Coordinates of C-alpha atoms in Angstrom, one line a residue:
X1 CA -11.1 -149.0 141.8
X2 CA -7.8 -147.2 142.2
X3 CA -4.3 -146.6 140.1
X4 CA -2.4 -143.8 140.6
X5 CA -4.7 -142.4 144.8
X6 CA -6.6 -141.9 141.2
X7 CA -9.9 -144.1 140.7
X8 CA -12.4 -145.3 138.2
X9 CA -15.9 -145.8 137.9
X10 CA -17.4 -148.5 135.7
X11 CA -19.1 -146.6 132.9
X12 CA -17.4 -143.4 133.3
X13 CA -15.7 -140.8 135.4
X14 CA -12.1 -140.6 137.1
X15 CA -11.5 -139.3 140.6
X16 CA -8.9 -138.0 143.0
X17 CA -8.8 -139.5 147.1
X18 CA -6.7 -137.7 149.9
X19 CA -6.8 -138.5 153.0
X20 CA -6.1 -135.6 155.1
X21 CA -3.7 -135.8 158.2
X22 CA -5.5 -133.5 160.0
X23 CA -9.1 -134.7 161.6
X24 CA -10.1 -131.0 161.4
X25 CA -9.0 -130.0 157.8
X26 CA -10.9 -133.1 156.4
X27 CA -14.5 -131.7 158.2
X28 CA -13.6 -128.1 157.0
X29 CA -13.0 -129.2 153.3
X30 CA -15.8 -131.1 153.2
X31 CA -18.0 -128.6 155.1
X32 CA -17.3 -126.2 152.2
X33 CA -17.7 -128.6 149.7
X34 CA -21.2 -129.7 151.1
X35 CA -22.4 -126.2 151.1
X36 CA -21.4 -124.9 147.6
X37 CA -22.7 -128.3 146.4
X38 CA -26.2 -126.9 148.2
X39 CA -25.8 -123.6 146.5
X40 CA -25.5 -125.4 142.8
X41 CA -28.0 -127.7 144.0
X42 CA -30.8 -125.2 145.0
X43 CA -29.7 -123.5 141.5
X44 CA -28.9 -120.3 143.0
X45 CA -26.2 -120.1 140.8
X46 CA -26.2 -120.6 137.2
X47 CA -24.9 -123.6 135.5
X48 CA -22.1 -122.0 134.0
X49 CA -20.4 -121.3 136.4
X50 CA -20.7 -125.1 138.8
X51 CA -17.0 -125.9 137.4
X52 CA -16.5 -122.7 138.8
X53 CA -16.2 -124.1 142.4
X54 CA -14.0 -127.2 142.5
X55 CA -14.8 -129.0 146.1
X56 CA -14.6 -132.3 147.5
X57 CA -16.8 -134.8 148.7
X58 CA -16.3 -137.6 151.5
X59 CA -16.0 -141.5 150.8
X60 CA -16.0 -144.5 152.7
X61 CA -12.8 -146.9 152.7
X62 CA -12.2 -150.1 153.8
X63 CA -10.2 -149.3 157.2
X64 CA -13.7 -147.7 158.2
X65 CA -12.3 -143.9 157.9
X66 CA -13.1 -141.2 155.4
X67 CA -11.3 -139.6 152.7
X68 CA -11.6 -136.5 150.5
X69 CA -13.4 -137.3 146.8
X70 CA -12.8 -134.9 144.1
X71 CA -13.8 -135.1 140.1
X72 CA -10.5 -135.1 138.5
X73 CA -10.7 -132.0 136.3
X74 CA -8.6 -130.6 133.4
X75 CA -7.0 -127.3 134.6
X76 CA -3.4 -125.2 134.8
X77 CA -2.5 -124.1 138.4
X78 CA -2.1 -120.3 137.7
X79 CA 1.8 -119.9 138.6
X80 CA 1.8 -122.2 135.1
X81 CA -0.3 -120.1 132.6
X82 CA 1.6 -116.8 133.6
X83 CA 5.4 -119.0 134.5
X84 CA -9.8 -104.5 130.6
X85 CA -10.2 -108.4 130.2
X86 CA -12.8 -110.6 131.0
X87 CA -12.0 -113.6 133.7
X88 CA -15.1 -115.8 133.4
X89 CA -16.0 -117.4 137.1
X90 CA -13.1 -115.5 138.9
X91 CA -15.9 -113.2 140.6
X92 CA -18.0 -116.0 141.7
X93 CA -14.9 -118.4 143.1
X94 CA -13.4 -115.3 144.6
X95 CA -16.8 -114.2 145.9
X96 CA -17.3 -117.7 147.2
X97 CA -13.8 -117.9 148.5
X98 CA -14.6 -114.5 150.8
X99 CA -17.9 -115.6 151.7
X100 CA -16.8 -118.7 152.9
X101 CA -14.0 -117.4 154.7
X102 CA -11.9 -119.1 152.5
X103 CA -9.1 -116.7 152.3
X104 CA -5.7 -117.6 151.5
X105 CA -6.1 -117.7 147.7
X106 CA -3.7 -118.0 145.6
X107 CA -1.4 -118.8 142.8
X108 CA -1.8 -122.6 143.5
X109 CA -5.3 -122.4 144.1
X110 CA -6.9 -120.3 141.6
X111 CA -6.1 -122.6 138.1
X112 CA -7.7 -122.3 135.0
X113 CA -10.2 -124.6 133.7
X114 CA -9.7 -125.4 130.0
X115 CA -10.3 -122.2 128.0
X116 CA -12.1 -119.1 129.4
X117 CA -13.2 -120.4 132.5
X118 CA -10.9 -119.3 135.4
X119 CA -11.7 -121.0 139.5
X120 CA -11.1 -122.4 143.2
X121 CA -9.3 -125.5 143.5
X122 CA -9.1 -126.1 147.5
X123 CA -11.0 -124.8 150.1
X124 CA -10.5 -124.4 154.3
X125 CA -13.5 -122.0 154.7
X126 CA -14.1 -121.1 158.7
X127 CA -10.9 -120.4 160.0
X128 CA -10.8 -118.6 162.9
X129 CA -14.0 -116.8 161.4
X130 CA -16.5 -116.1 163.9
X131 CA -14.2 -113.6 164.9
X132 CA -11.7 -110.0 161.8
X133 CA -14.8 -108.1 160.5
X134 CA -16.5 -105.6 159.5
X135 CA -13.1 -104.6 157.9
X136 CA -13.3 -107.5 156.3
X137 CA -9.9 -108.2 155.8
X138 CA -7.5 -110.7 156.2
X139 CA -5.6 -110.1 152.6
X140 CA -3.9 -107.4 154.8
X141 CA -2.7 -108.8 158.4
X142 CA -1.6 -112.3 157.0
X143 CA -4.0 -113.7 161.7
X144 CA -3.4 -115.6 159.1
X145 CA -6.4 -116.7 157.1
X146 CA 5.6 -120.8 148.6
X147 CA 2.2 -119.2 148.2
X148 CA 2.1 -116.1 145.8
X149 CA -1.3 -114.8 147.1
X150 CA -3.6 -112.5 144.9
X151 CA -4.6 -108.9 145.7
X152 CA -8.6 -108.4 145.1
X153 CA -8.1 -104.7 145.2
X154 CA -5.7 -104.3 142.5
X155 CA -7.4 -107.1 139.9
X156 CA -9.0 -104.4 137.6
X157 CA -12.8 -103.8 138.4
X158 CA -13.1 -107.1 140.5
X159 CA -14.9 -105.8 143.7
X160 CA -18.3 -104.3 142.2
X161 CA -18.1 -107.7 140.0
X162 CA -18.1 -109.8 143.4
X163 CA -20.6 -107.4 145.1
X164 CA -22.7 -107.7 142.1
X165 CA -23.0 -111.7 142.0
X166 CA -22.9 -110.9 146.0
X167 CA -26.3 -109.0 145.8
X168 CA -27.6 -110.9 143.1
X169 CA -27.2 -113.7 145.5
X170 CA -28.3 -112.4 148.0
X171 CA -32.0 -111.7 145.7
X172 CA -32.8 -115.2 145.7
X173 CA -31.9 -115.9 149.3
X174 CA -33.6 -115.6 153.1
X175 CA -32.5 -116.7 156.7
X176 CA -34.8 -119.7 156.4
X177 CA -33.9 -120.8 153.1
X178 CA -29.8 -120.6 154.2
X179 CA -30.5 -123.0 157.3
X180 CA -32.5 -125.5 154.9
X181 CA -28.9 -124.9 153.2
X182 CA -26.4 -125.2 156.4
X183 CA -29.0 -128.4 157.3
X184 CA -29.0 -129.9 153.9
X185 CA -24.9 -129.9 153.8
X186 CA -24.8 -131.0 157.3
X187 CA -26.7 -133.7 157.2
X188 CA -24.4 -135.1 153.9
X189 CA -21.6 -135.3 156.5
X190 CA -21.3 -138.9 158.5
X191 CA -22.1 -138.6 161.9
X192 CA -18.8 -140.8 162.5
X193 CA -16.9 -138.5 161.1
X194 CA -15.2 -136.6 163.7
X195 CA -14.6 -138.0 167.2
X196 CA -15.6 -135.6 170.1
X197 CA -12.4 -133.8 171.0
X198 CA -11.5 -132.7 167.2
X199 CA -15.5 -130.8 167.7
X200 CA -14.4 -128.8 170.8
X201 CA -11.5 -127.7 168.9
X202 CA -13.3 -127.0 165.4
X203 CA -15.7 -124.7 168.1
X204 CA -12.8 -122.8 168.8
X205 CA -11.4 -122.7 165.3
X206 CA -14.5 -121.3 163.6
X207 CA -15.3 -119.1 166.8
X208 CA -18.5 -120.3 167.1
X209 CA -19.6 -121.3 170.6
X210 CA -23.4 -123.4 169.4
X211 CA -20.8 -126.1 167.5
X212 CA -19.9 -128.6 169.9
X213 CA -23.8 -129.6 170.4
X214 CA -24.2 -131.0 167.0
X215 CA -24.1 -134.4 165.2
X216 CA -24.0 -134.6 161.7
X217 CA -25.3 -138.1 160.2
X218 CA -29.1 -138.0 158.3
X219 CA -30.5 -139.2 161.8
X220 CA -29.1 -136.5 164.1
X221 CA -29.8 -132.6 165.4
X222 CA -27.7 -129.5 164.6
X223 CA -30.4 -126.8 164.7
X224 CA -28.7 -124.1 166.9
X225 CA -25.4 -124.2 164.6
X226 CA -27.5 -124.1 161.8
X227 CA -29.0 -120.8 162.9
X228 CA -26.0 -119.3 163.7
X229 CA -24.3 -120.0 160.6
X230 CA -27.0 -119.0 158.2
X231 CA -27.0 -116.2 160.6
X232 CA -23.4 -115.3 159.9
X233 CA -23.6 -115.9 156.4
X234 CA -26.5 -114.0 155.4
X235 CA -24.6 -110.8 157.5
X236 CA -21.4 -111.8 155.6
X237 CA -23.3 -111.9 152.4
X238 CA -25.1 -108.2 153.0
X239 CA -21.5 -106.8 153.7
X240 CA -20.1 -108.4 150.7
X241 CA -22.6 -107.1 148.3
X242 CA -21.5 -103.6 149.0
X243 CA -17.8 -103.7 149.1
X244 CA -15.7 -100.8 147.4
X245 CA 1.6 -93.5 147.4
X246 CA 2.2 -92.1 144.0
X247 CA 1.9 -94.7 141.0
X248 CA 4.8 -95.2 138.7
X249 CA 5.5 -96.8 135.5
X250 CA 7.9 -97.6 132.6
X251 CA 7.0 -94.8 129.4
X252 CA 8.2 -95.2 125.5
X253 CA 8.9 -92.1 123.6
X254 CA 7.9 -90.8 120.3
X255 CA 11.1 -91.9 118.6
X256 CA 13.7 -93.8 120.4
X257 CA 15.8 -96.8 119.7
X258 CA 15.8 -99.5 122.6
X259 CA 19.3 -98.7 124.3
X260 CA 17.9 -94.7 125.1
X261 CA 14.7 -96.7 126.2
X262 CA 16.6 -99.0 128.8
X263 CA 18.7 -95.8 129.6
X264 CA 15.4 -94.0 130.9
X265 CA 14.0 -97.1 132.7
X266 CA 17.2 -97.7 134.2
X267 CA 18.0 -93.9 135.9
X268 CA 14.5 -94.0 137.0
X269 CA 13.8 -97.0 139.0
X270 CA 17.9 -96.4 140.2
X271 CA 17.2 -92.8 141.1
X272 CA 13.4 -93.6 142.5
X273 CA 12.8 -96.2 145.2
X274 CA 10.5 -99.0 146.1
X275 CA 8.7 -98.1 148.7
X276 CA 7.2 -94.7 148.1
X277 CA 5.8 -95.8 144.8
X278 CA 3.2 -98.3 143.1
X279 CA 4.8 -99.6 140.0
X280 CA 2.2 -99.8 137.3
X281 CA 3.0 -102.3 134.3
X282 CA -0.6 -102.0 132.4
X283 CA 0.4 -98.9 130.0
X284 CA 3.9 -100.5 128.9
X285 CA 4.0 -101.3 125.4
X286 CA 5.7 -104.6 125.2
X287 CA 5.3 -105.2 121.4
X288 CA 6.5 -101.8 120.5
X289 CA 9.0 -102.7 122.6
X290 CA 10.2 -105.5 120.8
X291 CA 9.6 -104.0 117.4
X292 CA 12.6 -101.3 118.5
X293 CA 14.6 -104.1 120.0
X294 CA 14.2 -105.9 116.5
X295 CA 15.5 -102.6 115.0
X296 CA 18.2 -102.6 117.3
X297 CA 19.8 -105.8 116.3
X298 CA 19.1 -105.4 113.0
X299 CA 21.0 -102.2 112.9
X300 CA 23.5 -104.0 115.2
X301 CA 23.9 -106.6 112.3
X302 CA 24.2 -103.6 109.6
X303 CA 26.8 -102.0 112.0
X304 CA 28.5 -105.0 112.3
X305 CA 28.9 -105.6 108.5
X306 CA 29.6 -102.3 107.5
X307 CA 32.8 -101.9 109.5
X308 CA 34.9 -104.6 108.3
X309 CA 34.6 -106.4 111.5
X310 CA 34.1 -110.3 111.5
X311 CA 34.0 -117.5 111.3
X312 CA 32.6 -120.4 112.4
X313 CA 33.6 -123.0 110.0
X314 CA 35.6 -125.3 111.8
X315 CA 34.1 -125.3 115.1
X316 CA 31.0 -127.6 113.2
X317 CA 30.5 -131.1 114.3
X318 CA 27.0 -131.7 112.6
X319 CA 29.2 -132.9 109.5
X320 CA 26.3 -132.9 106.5
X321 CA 23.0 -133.2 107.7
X322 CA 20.4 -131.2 108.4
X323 CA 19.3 -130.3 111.8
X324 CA 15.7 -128.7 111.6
X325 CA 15.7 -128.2 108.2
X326 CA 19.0 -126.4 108.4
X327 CA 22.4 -127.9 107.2
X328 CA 25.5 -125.9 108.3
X329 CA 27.2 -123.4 105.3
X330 CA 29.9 -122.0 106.6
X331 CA 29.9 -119.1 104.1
X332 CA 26.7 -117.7 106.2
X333 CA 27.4 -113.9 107.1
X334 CA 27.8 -113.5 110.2
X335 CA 25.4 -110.6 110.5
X336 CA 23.0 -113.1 109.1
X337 CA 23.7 -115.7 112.2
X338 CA 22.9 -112.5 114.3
X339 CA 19.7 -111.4 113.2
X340 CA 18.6 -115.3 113.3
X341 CA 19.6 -115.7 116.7
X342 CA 18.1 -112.8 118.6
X343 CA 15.6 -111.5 117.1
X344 CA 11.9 -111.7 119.2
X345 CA 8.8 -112.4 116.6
X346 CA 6.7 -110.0 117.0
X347 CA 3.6 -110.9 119.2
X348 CA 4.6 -113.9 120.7
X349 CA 7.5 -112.8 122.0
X350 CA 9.9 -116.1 122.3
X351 CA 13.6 -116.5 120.4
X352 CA 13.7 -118.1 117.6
X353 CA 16.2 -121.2 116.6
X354 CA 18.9 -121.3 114.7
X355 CA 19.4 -125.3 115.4
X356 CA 21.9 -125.5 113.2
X357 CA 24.4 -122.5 114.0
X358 CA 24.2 -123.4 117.8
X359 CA 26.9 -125.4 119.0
X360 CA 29.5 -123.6 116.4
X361 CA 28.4 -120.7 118.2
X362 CA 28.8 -122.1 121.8
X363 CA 32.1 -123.2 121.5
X364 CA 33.7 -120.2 120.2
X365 CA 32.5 -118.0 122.9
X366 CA 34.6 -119.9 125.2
X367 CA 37.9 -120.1 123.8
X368 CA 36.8 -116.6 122.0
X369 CA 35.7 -115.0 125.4
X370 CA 36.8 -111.7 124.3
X371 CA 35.2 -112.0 121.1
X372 CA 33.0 -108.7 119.9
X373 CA 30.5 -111.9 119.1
X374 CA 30.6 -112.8 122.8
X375 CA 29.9 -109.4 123.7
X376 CA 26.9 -108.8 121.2
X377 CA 25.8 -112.0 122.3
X378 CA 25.8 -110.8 126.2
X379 CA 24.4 -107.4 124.9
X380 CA 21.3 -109.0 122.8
X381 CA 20.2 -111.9 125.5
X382 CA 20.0 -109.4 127.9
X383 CA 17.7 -106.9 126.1
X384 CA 15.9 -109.8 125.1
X385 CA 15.9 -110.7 129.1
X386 CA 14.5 -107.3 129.8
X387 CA 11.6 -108.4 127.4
X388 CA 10.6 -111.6 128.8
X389 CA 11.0 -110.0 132.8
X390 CA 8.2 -107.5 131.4
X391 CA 6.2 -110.5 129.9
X392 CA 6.3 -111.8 133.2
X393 CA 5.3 -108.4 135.2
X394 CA 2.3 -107.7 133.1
X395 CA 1.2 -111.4 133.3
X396 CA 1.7 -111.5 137.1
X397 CA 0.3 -108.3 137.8
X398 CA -3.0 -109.0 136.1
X399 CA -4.1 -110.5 138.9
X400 CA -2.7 -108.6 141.6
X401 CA 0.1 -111.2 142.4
X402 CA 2.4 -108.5 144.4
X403 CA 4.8 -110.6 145.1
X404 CA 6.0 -112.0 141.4
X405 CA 6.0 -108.1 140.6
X406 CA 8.0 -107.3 142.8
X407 CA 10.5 -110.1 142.6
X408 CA 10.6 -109.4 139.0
X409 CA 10.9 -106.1 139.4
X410 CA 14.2 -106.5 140.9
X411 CA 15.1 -108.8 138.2
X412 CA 14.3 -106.0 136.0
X413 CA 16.8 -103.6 137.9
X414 CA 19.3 -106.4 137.8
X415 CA 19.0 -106.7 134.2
X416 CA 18.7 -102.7 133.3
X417 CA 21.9 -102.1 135.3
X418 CA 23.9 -105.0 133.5
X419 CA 22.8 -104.1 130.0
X420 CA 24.0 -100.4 130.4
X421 CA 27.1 -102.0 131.9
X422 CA 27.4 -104.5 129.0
X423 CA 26.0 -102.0 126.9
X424 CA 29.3 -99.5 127.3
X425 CA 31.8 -102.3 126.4
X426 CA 30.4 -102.7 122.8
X427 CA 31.9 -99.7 121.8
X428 CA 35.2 -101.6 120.5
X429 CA 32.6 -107.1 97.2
X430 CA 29.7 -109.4 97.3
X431 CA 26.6 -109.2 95.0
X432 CA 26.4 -112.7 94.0
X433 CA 24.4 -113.5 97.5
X434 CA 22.5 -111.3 100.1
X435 CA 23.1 -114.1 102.8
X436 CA 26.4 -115.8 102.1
X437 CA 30.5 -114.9 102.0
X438 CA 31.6 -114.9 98.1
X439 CA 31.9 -118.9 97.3
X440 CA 33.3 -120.0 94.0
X441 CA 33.1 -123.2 92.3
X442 CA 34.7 -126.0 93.6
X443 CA 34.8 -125.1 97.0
X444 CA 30.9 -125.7 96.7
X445 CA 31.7 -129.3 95.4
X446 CA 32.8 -130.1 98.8
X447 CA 29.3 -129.2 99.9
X448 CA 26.5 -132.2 99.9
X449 CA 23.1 -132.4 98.9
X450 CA 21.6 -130.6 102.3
X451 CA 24.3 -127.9 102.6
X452 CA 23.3 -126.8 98.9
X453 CA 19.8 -127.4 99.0
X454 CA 19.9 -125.1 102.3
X455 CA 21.5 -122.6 100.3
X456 CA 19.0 -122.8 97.5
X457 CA 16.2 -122.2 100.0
X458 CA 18.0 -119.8 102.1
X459 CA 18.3 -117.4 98.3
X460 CA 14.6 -117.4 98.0
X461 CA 14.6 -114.9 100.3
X462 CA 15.8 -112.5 97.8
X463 CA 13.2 -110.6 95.8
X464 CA 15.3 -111.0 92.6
X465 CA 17.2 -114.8 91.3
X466 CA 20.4 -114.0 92.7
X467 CA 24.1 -115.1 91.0
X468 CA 24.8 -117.8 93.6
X469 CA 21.6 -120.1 93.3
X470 CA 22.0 -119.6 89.1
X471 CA 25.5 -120.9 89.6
X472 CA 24.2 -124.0 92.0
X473 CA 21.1 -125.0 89.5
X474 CA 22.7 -124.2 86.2
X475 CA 24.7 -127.3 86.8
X476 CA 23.9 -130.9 86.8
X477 CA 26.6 -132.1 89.0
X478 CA 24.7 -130.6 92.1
X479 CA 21.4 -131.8 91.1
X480 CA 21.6 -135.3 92.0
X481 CA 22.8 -134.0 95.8
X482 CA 20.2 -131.4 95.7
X483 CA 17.0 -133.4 94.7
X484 CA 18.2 -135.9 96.7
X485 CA 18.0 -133.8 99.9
X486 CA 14.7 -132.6 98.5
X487 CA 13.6 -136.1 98.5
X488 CA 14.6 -137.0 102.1
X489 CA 11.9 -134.7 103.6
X490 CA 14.0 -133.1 105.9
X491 CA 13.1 -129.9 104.8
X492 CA 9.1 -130.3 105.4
X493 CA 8.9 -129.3 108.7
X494 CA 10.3 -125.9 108.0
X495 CA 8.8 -122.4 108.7
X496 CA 9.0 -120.8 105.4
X497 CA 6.5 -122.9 103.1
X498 CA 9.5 -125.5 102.3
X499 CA 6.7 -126.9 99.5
X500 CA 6.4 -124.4 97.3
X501 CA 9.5 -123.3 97.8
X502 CA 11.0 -126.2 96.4
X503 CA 8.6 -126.9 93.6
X504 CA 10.1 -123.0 92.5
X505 CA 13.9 -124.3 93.0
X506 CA 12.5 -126.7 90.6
X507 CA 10.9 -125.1 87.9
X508 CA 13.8 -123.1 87.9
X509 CA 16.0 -125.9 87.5
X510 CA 14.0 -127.1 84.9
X511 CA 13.9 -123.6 82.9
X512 CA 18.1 -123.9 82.6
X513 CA 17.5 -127.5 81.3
X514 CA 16.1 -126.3 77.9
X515 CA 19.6 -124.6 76.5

């Protein structure tokens, strides 16, 4: 029984139900689907790797036509996990996916069953097919058969993988035992399943003249057919199981710092071209990468606070509260700000947030759009930019997905070229607090409970009690606000173990209570 067209069983299970447009495509799917069901069912294939090879199966509706049954399974399409390592069940869906003629894999159809395990989602084996041998290749001259199609050749150490679970196969196998197997999955099929004219055109799809003299229900014959595709198969099979300009790619130095990095990246690929080279992303070092970009904008910041340069006091809306654990202080250095908003941690890569210094910062850099804060801002993203693009190209070209590296690529140029352009544009007390503009007194008592309280946690940062959080829990006045805040629980979600840290603005509270 159906919601969504998504069904139910009564004790257990969950399906999926298409009904194809096509008379042919449904017989094709279900062909495949009938025959690697054989495959699992014979146990020529380990059980580990069944939800390896996601097919359908055929079901009987109401109208008295036939639709396309498949388990619902758990699984990321593989544009959405990447949007030598080990790819457990790629060899056997891919190996599957040649044998079967199945070859317009791609992006959309390999997904990524929960964990490890890595598969074939939908399958249109025997197209044109009896045909585009013993090359074996329809990867090249897509005869074909948004799509961002995988390469087999360039997925690291994939084709003596294949050819070995190809032979291995092919151990357990002979030409009678594959027709029991092309029998067995053809009898599963209803004979009613395809009218007579859809079978003279499936003969000349698959190629394969002995077709059109078959029926397919439990009580029918389709012994010539099933010769000649066992026949093909095992041939297909023995071929499979022995299967076998310049390169270029993006080099860190010794000792650089990330603008000289970009700088060589970016005369290369603009001196180079596209065309007479292979662009190779596996020996980039992405996290040293980022390590130097984090030393760039740290320096940035130290640059930026050692000339007098630099604020965004008014432009606040939040008024007192906390957002994300944050309350806005005005008195926050700018060069702090900076650092908070674009630096990359360290092995995940991704931005972190500054919730609270956000919008202030947003509006600002319009009616300031010839601010040096615009301009580092335009700088940073874009190095930052550069990171992710890479992210993406190493991803991508894991599995030999040409086309994402190549668009990317470009993206890459795009962004090298307008970070040296933005990059050339750049060029033009306090000891109470590490993080914070000199406050005094009383233009503190204008601050509230989370405004304080986020400048008692943001001093913990400092190795040594600094002046300024002595000066905020010496008094009593602020208390009240403070432990107030504290009590809220605003602060528990925080990064920075926001427990402790308070039980320690305590305890220090509590040591200037005594005299």
């Amino acid at each position: 029984v159906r919601f969504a067209g998504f069904y139910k069983d009564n004790d257990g299970g969950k399906f999926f139900i298409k009904k194809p447009g096509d008379p042919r495509e449904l017989f094709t799917e279900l062909f495949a689907g009938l025959l690697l069901k054989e495959f699992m069912k014979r146990g020529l294939i380990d059980e580990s790797y069944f939800p390896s090879l996601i097919c359908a199966d055929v079901i009987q509706f109401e109208d008295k036509s036939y639709g396309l049954i498949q388990p619902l399974v758990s699984f990321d399409e593989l544009h959405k996990v990447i949007g030598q390592n080990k790819y457990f069940g790629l060899s056997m869906a891919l190996m599957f996916s040649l044998l079967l003629g199945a070859h317009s894999v791609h992006s959309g159809n390999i997904v990524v069953l929960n964990g490890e395990e890595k598969e074939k989602s939908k399958q249109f084996g025997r197209i044109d097919w009896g045909d585009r041998y013993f090359a074996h290749p329809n990867n090249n001259d897509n005869l074909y058969a948004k799509d961002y199609f995988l390469n087999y050749k360039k997925i690291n150490g994939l084709f003596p993988a294949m050819a070995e679970k190809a032979r291995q196969l092919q151990s357990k196998l002979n030409p009678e035992l594959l027709v029991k197997i092309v029998t067995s999955a053809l009898k599963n099929i209803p004979a009613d399943l395809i009218d007579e004219k859809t079978k003279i055109q499936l003969a000349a799809y698959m190629c394969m003249d002995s077709f059109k003299e078959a029926t397919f229900g439990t009580e029918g014959n389709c012994k010539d057919f099933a010769i000649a595709m066992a026949t093909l198969l095992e041939n297909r099979l023995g071929k499979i199981a022995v299967l076998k300009l310049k390169p270029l790619t993006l080099l860190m130095t010794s000792s650089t710092s990330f603008s000289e990095t970009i700088n060589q990246w970016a005369d290369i690929l603009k001196t180079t071209d596209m065309e007479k080279f292979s662009f190779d992303s596996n020996p980039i070092n992405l996290l040293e990468l980022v390590k130097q970009f984090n030393l760039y904008v740290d320096e940035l910041a130290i640059t930026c606070e050692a000339n007098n340069v630099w604020l965004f006091a008014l432009y606040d809306n939040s008024g007192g509260e906390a957002i994300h654990g944050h309350a806005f202080v005005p008195y926050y250095k700018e060069s702090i700000v900076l650092r908070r908003l674009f630096t990359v941690d360290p092995n995940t890569f991704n931005l972190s947030r500054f919730a609270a210094f956000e919008g202030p910062c947003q509006l600002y850099c319009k009616e300031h759009k010839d601010s040096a804060w615009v301009k580092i801002q335009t700088l940073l993203t874009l190095g930052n930019g550069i990171i992710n693009t890479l992210k993406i190209i190493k991803q991508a070209q894991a599995f030999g997905i040409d086309e994402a590296v190549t668009e990317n690529l470009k993206a890459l140029k795009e962004q090298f070229i307008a970070f040296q352009l933005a990059e050339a544009d750049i060029k033009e007390p306090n000891k109470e607090s590490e993080f914070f503009y000199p406050i005094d007194e009383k233009a503190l008592a204008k601050m509230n409970g989370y405004q304080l309280a986020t400048i008692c946690l943001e001093e913990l940062n400092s190795p040594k009690p600094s002046p300024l959080i002595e000066r905020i829990l010496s008094n009593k006045k602020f208390w009240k606000r403070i432990n107030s805040a504290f009590e809220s629980g605003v602060f528990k979600g925080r990064t920075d173990d926001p427990a402790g840290k308070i039980a320690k603005i305590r305890e220090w509270h509590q040591l200037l209570q005594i005299s």
